[PDB]
RNA sequence: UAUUAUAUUUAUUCAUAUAAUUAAUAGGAUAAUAUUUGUAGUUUUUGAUACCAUGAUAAGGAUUAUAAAUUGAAAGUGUUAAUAUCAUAAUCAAAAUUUAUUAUUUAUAUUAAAUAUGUAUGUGUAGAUAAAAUAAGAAAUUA
């Protein structure tokens, strides 16, 4: 006949309330206070798990450190190297950028002594290998121990 | 701002040369903060929920 | 004055058709009359174009006056007279204002733009700092650094 | 100017009084606070178009770090960032599969429970019932492609396929 | 339409169209229904 | 909930999400009733304390109330705890005065 | 007084994809919640005017009174001994303020009629339905599927906007009633059709600060400059407070009643109280600290 | 697209000359690798602070059987100029061996080494369009 | 006659079995009776849909390093493996080991449930990784390989259903799961301790005596398996002189009806019942009375009742206590029970 | 597999729960991979507890660590594949083809409403919005707005 | 904890399946079909 | 290093020819433009500079 | 939608042709780093030629007299130092602080192109010859 | 102010009026928009083949 | 005829896809008891595929208008619902330009964060071409 209540009669109100239970933490009672030591670390199952960033894992935190170091031997990671630790074995390992020190360039850093220059018109014009004659006397540095 | 004592500061600078004459770089890669990085850009701004924007949490 | 480079050539039609967004530019009127004020000259040129061009913006947002139906047709060329002479005062006024500049930066000793001509100190225009190691017009090499235009005393 | 951060104790002064610095350290300590030493002190910018209200954007809040040098590589940078656990990337991830019900329960128990047997797709029975039709009218255009084939090479012990005609 | 077909839960066409209900019909609720209420089924848990 | 993820395989993770985004737990304390005796006959907080708390927090405080938002825990009692614990932290630091 | 004065704020938020759904949906929350909160405020008020009906000195419990004299100095520069009487007026002024305010309450619930109900104002009506400014996704998006043509893509934008407005219900109860409460929570099913409910919760607590455990020491001899709040140092360098005190001293061979407690820096007798089953101090025994 | 060069081209649309955000691209087509940069070399596309640990083409994470090549992600270091072994990088075609070691790859990755679009293009692949094309923008003579 | 992909399968069930049961037939899928899963592939064969079946961490793939072909044909260009030997030369191996991959199990929840960190995701309920035995994760063999095909593979036969369930996974899903698969009461009706375990309850219970109650909580947050019901009592009794009655109960509840009802011991209550005691709570009592004289489902099911002259002494505290405290209405309750 | 009873009609709508699990896993090496990060990068001194050769042992140790994490998820977010669950067409985030809320293409998203599949309500196409947010200051203002209410508001304690 | 799970697709299909074998499923959602739609007073004024 | 004094294939590359013309399409030739200015006629050259 | 042409086979051998292609190209790339990096760094240690402009105050002044007196009895050791390189110049300019901001609010200096000649060129074909083998970014002579 | 000055004082309102200061001009940019390059007015270049 | 104006302005150097197995349900504490702790019948079919495998939503201005009004349309542009019977091609990083259907930053200061384009100085310069009367400011030859 074309009728809708405006407003759930109470009848059907209960029925929805009733249908369902509810939840225990829905009531919040408290008489003893919060637990300062123990609620936080209670038992690992049903344990506060910190959400958002790092800075609210300490616990897990030091347990990561602790487990790593437990597992991780400085045998494993003694070769993993630096970028520069690697590229100090480059014929320029060094140039300052043209920003600052770019008038702290010296020619001495130009490895000359691998490269070779025609003086009609003063440029370098072919490179002599050092891949053969190149000897160092710490392939990786003296804190490396095999 | 309060800082480290021991430690040789400068203060916010007057003079508007030492900016220009300064090595500080301009933002060239992309641009993060680090919450906002969860939504990845301005025109795909993701959001968990229908939250107003004007939500007064409590 | 900064702006050194290269700049573009537009005819005074189209300078002035920029109506009151440049052309009839409220501020560019007030500072180019503030030249003539201070060089102690009568502002009856640029006072003129002000004032056709307050006219033409106080008339702008309404439709024009109503057309008959002439074989004859004598509106048509008379309104033309009338915009031309209008026309004619904006391009004589053009050319006082940019005369009076490349007068008064020959005066400040004040260099111009590049290849704007300055009769007060080189017959030619000033070309220096180019992105070009020719002459833009004269296809003549630039001297390193900027060539120099006025006394050395400041 | 280059002037040197200094703080004098609150022993030295003849007033004592609790130094900034001192109460800094104290903040730092009670709410975990970083404090990032190579902070230099040139750098007190505010996000004028977030902190200055002449703008359209006026937040009040600086709404980012007005700094070029920045990027998720850093450790400053991934301290105070929020991680994917219980965001929108996982509530996208358990609920956008293609097919909405098998979010809600798997297909052979909804019909093992309300109808008896576990229904195909729509896909599949417009297959088979394309197979019943088109294998009712003619027959050999078919192919014989299985998951396992022992079966079919080797039937059981009867089962001699009909010849048909 | 379609094999990965409707779903009649998200869809406002079959939300509600004239064998649904439609926005601007009072949307209110249209029978409580008590199902937990009139037999519970016993507790009864696969794992022991 | 109550639309959609209310019953099904869903409903469970669906909840978790939910009540962990809304985790926070806000905490506004006034610091006029700070301003009380400490049961040692004591003012508990007198003006200089008052300036030392203000002074320690930086932004938690405004309007003459202090507010902590107690973000870490996904559960509501945790945050609860966790906040009180935080509270009464900030507090017996500016106790000094 | 009246309006501004709360105990626990609902502010129930019912999202809704449309916003007439959530305008009368508003309406009739706000009717079942204010018959709601009437009764429950009728309850509290006939209970509170029982409670204010016959207060003297001869209607009080010693629990109240040893919490109103729990102290150990007050403000006459001597503790205080509140009797049945001092602590009367005390209650009596609270019972009179609280009913003021939910008197205050019933009034505007019973002030909006269905001639000229303002749900929209909360000087006239308990509870007030707040607007709240919708959620609104404006997309842009293309509609083409030319594979060819970027332009023919661009020019084929759509705007379209996924709404989802809200109302909050805002019940400034000044008193926290857990009958009221579970009788909201159960909104959350008799809620209308493509509407559901986010209720904020701001009720009053108490949080006790408290001596042995969080204390207000001087500073320490060693400074902790800022070394000690480095990066990873949150985690590594600090623990997480309180720090445990040990609560268990150890008794001295020579000691006394009085060399313990100017040991552990306690009063004698606060000593004698923390550890009231010993009369004279043995050795190698363990005594309680009082935190005091 | 229209001359599906991989099984993608099959299934991804061109959209035209499509403008991107800036750094958003489901195809990183390193087109810019061999860039000399020369008071940059330790900076374009390099790592960022020079004191960072190496990427992960350059350990062993498990006990793996072996590799077919390696990425040009990991970097050139002394292992890779006096081992003197196979280092191989998934360049186009099919693969591109570092066996002509020198000393100045070390220190970058191999990216900066390996041509990612060639001078030479074979008319192999191209089409009796593209070589015409190719023609047209300068690239084969004809 | 037939292109078909599989060769032979394996029975599930064996012919001390089928031989019987063969003579009833199976109610099988009306649209396709016969169901060639992933159960009945061979070792050899499901091996292959095992290594497979992952993007580049499956060794299925050539260059994704446990692969097992030597040679590659990359568009009539041919491909071989540079092995680990020749590898080393210039990609030094780290390689901690099977134990790299098994996070913690304090790191559970920071890691979202998980142990594991394979590529493929380990679930720890049974149903799910389940290939003919249920799936046990066995958190020391953890490999690559993955011979146990235990894994919540990608793209492999009959995917489809285990990833519908791994998504419709629930909310505590790993560690529920996890708890319970293992860690169950034994048949001699004994509570789980357990080897591994006692050491560390030795830190706790020594602790907590000595008093250093952060100490032993910050110790107990590392119990991962159940304690004996000692360690409850040492970590309660240590809160006895500071009162910390909310520390107290927490340390209670967390074995009272989460760890087998451990915490449901007489001298347990006690501690807590000292620690309302000199917190001085009427209601604390009675919640630790109330404890006490518990209810059918512990008293019975559980089996985790408290010996009489337990009863009695925590009752006598109770009194004690109380009828000090003048609560004359609730100590003759007690002594009502009495 | 071998188009042998296909259920569905798209074969690449495996794909999609090929990403779900790829978010699952994110999730799931996520905070492991962002503290080894931190501690790896880490160049001022960590804590009064640990420094100096102790932090280059450990740094180097936790790297070695992050590097055998095998199966960890080091792709960008940004990075993985982004397609809709309906039709598998992808979709570029940050472009017009890509619904973020629905997770869904301007392909399949524009039949869902052209047909009656999703509840919009049509805008006008050239203007801002209803949003006066969106209206104010673009996009980047309502991101902005988003990131102040889902992180700025709470006095964080 | 329970209601965390309590909603699980297969305990709303054991509750189903316990109606099923006790032989009601005439308040249930899925298992009950009502076939017969009832139809309105038709208006004798508004015959057209 | 040694670099060899002969180069195998990629020196042997087809030259790609520098763009002719400046300008749009790089077509746009070395020719006068109607940008030219006048230094001859009048103190403010025509067309004038801005 | 036309179903798109898979691109056809590869070849013979190109793929070793790329490989020797490759091969000789980052061997070439050897040279013209080296020789880069040498062109870079001696434009970096060359003293430039003056980065501000003589167009404007206060470096319109005689070279006698007013800013220039101060450039030649304070400065004129440091500009030669550090090579008239113009961000050095400039910084040194800033702190000579008896000049105040005008060393960038008066002074003009030389565009980043015309800054970087070396010292006492006179031609305007110095910028547009520079060598274009050497990929300094435009950083050498 | 027109508006201010009609609400002081009325019989303003007439001249204000009549001067057409209370007068609205319904004017705004073109909307923003991809299809156009500046997103207010230019559609992309358009080439046939 | 009237119910009413285009001859002006700003424009043109344009490119990006990859390394095969999609077939199903299986509940765990504060619940009056299932080891169901760990639920084991293999192998009778074949389409959305690398391959024919219908349908269904764009771009495009040229005469319904002035006032309280918007200068964007249906003719369908790749992914979609009945034709079968060649082959697994599908993002988890690092990627190979031939594809008409594209607005590049222009001479005081030039590489710091997932890496981020080293080429083309040249009289604003052939031919043909682009856009727009909308908060900007335009004015006269209807079929």
């Given at each position: ?146 | ?58 | ?154 | ?165 | ?48 | ?97 | ?292 | ?142 | ?222 119990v991962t398996t159940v304690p004996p019901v000692e360690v409850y009592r040492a970590l309660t009794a240590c809160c006895i002189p500071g009162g910390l009655i909310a ?92 | ?157 | ?48 | ?50 | ?141 | ?32 928009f991809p299809g156009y390059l500046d997103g207010k007015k230019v559609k992309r270049k358009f080439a046939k083949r």
């Amino acid at each position: 006949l074309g009728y809708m209540h405006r407003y759930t009669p109470w009848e059907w109100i209960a029925v929805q309330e009733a249908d369902q239970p509810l939840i225990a933490e829905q009531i919040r009672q408290d008489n003893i206070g919060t637990s300062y030591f123990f609620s936080l670390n209670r038992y690992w199952r049903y344990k506060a798990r910190p959400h958002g960033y790092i800075r609210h894992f300490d616990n897990e935190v030091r347990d990561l450190f602790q487990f790593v170091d437990g597992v991780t031997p400085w045998k494993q990671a003694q070769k993993i190297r630096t970028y520069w630790e690697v590229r100090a074995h480059h014929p320029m390992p060094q140039f300052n950028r043209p920003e600052v020190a770019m008038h702290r360039n010296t020619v001495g850093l130009l490895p000359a002594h691998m490269w070779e220059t025609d003086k009609k018109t003063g440029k370098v014009k072919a490179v002599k290998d050092s891949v053969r004659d190149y000897q160092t006397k710490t392939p990786l540095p003296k804190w490396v121990q095999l | 701002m309060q800082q480290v004592p021991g430690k040789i500061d400068q203060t916010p600078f007057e003079e508007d040369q030492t900016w220009l004459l300064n090595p500080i770089p301009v933002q060239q890669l992309e641009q993060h903060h680090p919450e906002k990085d969860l939504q990845d850009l301005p025109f795909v701004n993701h959001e968990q929920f229908p939250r107003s924007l004007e939500w007064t949490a409590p | 004055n900064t702006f050194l480079t290269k700049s573009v050539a537009t005819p005074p039609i189209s300078v002035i058709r920029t109506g009151p967004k440049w052309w009839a530019d409220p501020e560019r009127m007030v500072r180019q009359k503030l030249m003539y004020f201070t060089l102690g000259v009568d502002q009856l040129p640029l006072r003129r174009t002000a004032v056709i061009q307050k006219d033409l913006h106080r008339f702008h947002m309404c439709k024009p006056p109503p057309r008959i139906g002439d074989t004859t047709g004598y509106k048509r060329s008379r309104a033309a007279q009338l915009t031309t002479w209008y026309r004619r005062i904006q391009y004589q006024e053009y050319h006082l204002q940019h005369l009076f500049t490349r007068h008064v930066w020959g005066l400040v000793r004040a260099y111009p733009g590049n290849t704007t001509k300055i009769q007060g100190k080189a017959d030619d225009g000033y070309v220096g700092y180019d992105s070009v190691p020719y002459h833009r017009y004269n296809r003549t090499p630039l001297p390193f650094p900027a060539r120099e235009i006025y006394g050395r005393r400041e | 100017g280059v002037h040197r951060v200094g703080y004098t104790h609150p022993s030295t002064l003849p007033v004592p009084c609790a130094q900034r610095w001192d109460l800094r350290l104290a903040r730092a300590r009670i709410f975990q606070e970083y404090i990032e030493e190579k902070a230099p002190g040139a750098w007190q910018l505010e996000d004028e178009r977030s902190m200055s209200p002449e703008f359209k954007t006026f937040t009040g809040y600086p709404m980012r770090e007005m700094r070029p040098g920045y990027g998720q590589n850093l450790p400053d940078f991934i301290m105070k960032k929020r991680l994917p656990n219980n965001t929108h990337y996982e509530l996208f991830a358990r609920r956008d599969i293609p097919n909405e019900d098998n979010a809600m329960y798997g297909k052979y128990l909804y019909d093992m429970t309300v109808h008896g047997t576990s229904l195909p797709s729509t896909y599949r029975m417009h297959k088979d019932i394309n197979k019943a039709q088109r294998n009712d009218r003619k027959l050999s255009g078919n192919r014989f492609r299985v998951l396992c084939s022992s079966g079919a090479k080797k039937p059981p012990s009867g089962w001699e396929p009909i010849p048909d005609a | 339409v379609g094999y990965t077909p409707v779903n009649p839960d998200t869809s406002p066409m079959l939300a509600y169209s004239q064998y649904h209900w439609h926005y601007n019909l009072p949307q209110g609720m249209e029978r409580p229904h008590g199902v937990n209420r009139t037999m519970t089924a016993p507790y009864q848990s696969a794992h022991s | 909930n109550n639309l959609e993820y209310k019953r099904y395989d869903w409903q469970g993770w669906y909840q978790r999400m939910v009540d962990v985004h809304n985790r926070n737990i806000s905490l506004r304390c006034r610091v006029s009733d700070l301003k009380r005796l400490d049961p040692n006959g004591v003012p508990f907080v007198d003006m200089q304390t008052e300036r030392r708390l203000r002074i320690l927090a930086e932004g938690r405080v405004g309007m003459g109330v202090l507010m902590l938002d107690s973000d870490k825990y996904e559960d509501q009692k945790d945050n609860m705890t966790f906040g009180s614990i935080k509270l009464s932290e900030l507090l017996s630091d500016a106790r000094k005065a | 007084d009246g309006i501004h004065g709360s105990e626990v704020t609902y502010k129930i938020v019912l999202e809704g994809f449309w916003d007439h759904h959530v305008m009368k949906l508003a309406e009739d929350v706000c009717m079942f919640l204010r018959d709601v909160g009437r009764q429950v405020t009728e309850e509290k008020l006939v209970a509170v005017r029982r409670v204010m009906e016959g207060l003297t000195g001869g209607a009080f419990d010693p629990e109240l009174i040893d919490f109103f004299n729990a102290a150990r100095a007050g403000p006459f520069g001597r503790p205080d001994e509140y009797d049945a009487e001092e602590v009367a007026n005390f209650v009596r002024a609270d019972l009179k303020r609280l009913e003021e305010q939910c008197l205050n309450v019933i009034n505007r619930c019973n002030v909006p009629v269905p001639g000229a109900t303002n749900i929209y104002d909360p000087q006239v009506s308990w509870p007030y339905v707040e607007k709240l400014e919708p959620w609104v996704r404006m997309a842009e998006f293309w509609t083409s599927s030319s594979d060819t043509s970027f332009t023919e893509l661009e020019m084929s934008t759509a705007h379209y906007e996924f709404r989802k407005y809200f109302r909050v219900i805002i019940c400034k109860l000044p008193f926290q009633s857990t009958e009221f409460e579970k009788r909201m929570y159960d909104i959350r099913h008799w809620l209308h059709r493509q509407t559901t409910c986010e209720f904020h919760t701001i009720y009053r607590k108490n949080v006790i600060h408290d001596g042995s455990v969080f204390p207000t020491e001087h500073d320490p001899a060693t400074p902790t400059t800022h070394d000690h709040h480095r990066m990873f140092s949150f985690a590594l360098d600090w623990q997480s407070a309180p720090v445990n005190r040990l609560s268990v001293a150890r008794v001295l061979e020579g000691d006394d009643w009085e060399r313990v407690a100017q040991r552990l820096g306690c009063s004698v007798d606060d000593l004698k109280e923390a550890n009231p089953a010993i009369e004279e101090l043995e050795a190698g025994a363990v005594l309680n600290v009082p935190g005091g | 697209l229209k001359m599906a060069k991989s099984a993608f081209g099959f299934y991804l649309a061109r959209r035209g000359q499509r403008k991107f955000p800036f750094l958003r691209r489901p195809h990183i087509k390193n087109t810019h690798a061999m860039n000399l940069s020369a008071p940059y070399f330790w900076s374009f596309m390099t790592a960022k602070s020079q004191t960072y640990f190496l990427p992960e083409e350059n350990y062993i994470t498990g006990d793996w059987t072996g590799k077919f090549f390696v990425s040009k992600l990991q970097v050139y270091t002394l292992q890779h100029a006096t081992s003197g072994s196979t280092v191989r990088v998934k360049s186009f075609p099919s693969v591109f061996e570092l066996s002509s070691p020198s000393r100045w790859n070390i220190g970058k990755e191999l990216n900066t080494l390996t041509k990612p679009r060639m001078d030479l293009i074979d008319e192999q692949m191209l089409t009796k369009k593209q070589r015409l094309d190719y023609v047209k923008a300068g690239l084969l003579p004809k | 006659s037939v292109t078909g992909v599989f060769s032979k399968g394996r029975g599930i069930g064996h012919a001390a079995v089928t031989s019987i049961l063969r003579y009833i037939p199976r109610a099988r899928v009306p649209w396709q009776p016969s169901r060639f899963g992933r159960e009945n592939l061979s070792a050899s064969d499901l091996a292959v849909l095992w290594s497979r079946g992952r993007y580049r961490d499956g060794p299925g793939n050539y260059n994704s390093g446990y692969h097992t072909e030597k040679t590659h044909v990359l568009e009539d260009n041919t491909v071989t493996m540079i092995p680990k030997h020749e590898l080393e030369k210039y990609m030094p191996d780290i390689s901690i080991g099977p134990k790299a991959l098994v996070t913690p199990v304090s790191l559970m929840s920071a890691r979202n449930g998980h142990r594991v960190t394979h590529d493929l995701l380990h679930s720890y309920d049974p149903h799910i990784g389940r290939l003919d035995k249920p799936a046990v994760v066995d958190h020391d063999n953890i490999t690559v390989e993955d011979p146990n095909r235990v894994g919540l593979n990608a793209a492999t036969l009959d995917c489809r259903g285990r990833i519908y369930r791994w998504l419709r996974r629930g909310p505590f899903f790993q560690e529920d799961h996890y708890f319970r698969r293992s860690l169950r009461l034994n048949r001699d009706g004994t509570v789980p301790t357990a080897a591994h375990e006692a050491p560390l309850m030795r830190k706790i219970v020594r602790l907590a005596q000595r008093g250093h109650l952060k100490a032993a909580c910050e110790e107990y947050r590392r119990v991962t398996t159940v304690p004996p019901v000692e360690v409850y009592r040492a970590l309660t009794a240590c809160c006895i002189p500071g009162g910390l009655i909310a520390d107290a109960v927490a340390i209670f509840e967390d074995g009272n009806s989460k760890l087998f009802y451990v915490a449901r011991d007489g001298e347990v209550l006690h501690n807590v019942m000292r620690c309302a005691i000199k917190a001085k709570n009427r209601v604390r009592v009675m919640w630790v009375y109330n404890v006490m004289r518990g209810r059918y489902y512990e008293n019975v099911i559980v089996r985790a009742e408290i010996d009489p002259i337990w009863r009695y002494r925590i009752a006598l505290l109770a009194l004690e206590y109380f009828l000090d405290h003048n609560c004359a209405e609730e100590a003759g309750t007690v002594y009502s029970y009495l | 597999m071998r188009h042998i009873g296909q259920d569905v009609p798209k074969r690449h709508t495996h794909f999609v729960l090929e990403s779900r699990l790829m978010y699952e896993k994110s999730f799931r090496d996520s905070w492991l991979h962002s503290v080894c990060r931190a501690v790896s990068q880490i160049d001022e001194p960590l804590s009064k507890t640990i420094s100096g050769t102790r932090q280059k042992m450990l740094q180097r140790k936790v790297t070695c660590f992050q590097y055998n994490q095998y199966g960890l998820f080091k792709v960008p977010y940004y990075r993985l594949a982004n397609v809709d669950r309906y039709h598998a067409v992808q979709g570029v985030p940050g472009t017009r083809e890509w619904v973020p809320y629905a997770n869904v293409s301007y392909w399949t998203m524009n039949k869902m409403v052209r047909s009656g599949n999703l509840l919009v309500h049509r805008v006008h196409y050239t203007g801002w919005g209803t949003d006066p947010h969106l209206k104010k200051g673009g996009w980047e203002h309502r991101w902005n707005k988003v990131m102040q209410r889902n992180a700025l508001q709470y006095s964080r304690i | 904890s329970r209601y965390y799970e309590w909603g699980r697709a297969v305990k709303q299909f054991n509750f189903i399946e316990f109606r099923r074998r006790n032989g009601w499923m005439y308040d249930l959602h899925l298992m009950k079909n009502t076939t017969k739609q009832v139809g309105p007073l038709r208006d004798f004024n508004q015959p057209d | 290093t040694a670099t060899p004094e002969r180069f195998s294939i990629l020196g042997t590359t087809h030259p790609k020819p520098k763009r002719t013309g400046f300008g749009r399409n790089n077509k746009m030739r070395s020719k006068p433009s109607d940008n030219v200015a006048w230094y001859d006629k009048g103190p403010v050259e025509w067309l004038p500079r801005p | 939608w036309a179903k798109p042409k898979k691109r056809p086979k590869v070849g013979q051998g190109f793929h070793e042709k790329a490989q020797k292609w490759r091969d000789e190209f980052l061997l070439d790339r050897h040279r013209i780093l080296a020789d880069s990096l040498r062109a870079y760094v001696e434009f970096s240690a060359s003293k430039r030629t003056e980065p501000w402009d003589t167009r404007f105050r206060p470096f319109d002044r005689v070279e006698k007299d007013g800013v220039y007196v101060l450039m030649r009895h304070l400065m004129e050791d440091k500009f030669q130092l550090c090579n008239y390189h113009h961000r050095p110049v400039k910084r040194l300019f800033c702190n000579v602080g008896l000049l105040g901001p005008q060393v960038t609010t008066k002074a003009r200096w030389k565009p980043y192109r015309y800054a970087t000649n070396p010292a006492n060129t006179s031609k305007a074909e110095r910028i547009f010859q520079k060598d274009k083998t050497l990929y300094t970014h435009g950083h050498n002579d | 102010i027109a508006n201010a000055l009609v609400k002081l004082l009325p019989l303003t309102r007439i001249p204000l009026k009549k001067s057409g200061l209370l007068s609205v001009d319904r004017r705004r940019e073109r909307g923003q928009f991809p299809g156009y390059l500046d997103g207010k007015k230019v559609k992309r270049k358009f080439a046939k083949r």
